[PDB]
């Protein structure tokens, strides 16, 4: 069920990470360190506070466009 939730959040955090850092809007950070530093406020990145390694990993793998 958390697997089902994780996938839901996967898309929504990409929706969040894209909403913030889109194609042309904001460049997708070179490192998740600066990403999360600026990101920390939008609660969808708090949706993976217990699934940290997942969130860092998807962020990098997201790829805009």
Curated annotation (Swiss-Prot):
Signal peptide: none annotated. Belongs to the PRPF40 family. The chain holds residues 488 to 552 of 583 of the full protein. It comes from Saccharomyces cerevisiae (strain ATCC 204508 / S288c) (Baker's yeast). Required for pre-spliceosome formation, which is the first step of pre-mRNA splicing. This protein is associated with snRNP U1. Two commitment complexes, CC1 and CC2, have been defined in yeast. CC1 is a basal complex dependent only on the 5' splice site. CC2 is a complex of lower mobility and is dependent on a branchpoint as well as a 5' splice site region. This protein is involved in CC2 formation where it binds to the branchpoint binding protein MSL5, bridging the U1 snRNP-associated 5' splice site and the MSL5-associated branch point 3' intron splice site. This is Pre-mRNA-processing protein PRP40. It comes from the Eukaryota. Residues 4-65 form the FF domain. It is found in: Nucleus. The WW and FF domains bind to the phosphorylated carboxy-terminal domain of RPB1. Interacts with CRM1, MSL5, PRP8, and the RNA polymerase II largest subunit (RPB1). MSL5, MUD2 and PRP40 interact to form the commitment complex 2 (CC2), a precursor of mature spliceosomes.
């Amino acid at each position: 069920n958390e697997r089902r939730i994780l996938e839901q959040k996967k898309h929504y955090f990409w929706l969040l990470l894209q909403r913030t850092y889109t194609k042309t809007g904001k460049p997708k950070p070179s490192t998740w360190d600066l990403a999360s530093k600026e990101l920390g406020e939008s609660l969808e990145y708090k949706a993976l506070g217990d699934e940290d390694n997942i969130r860092r990993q998807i962020f990098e793998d997201f790829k805009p466009e």
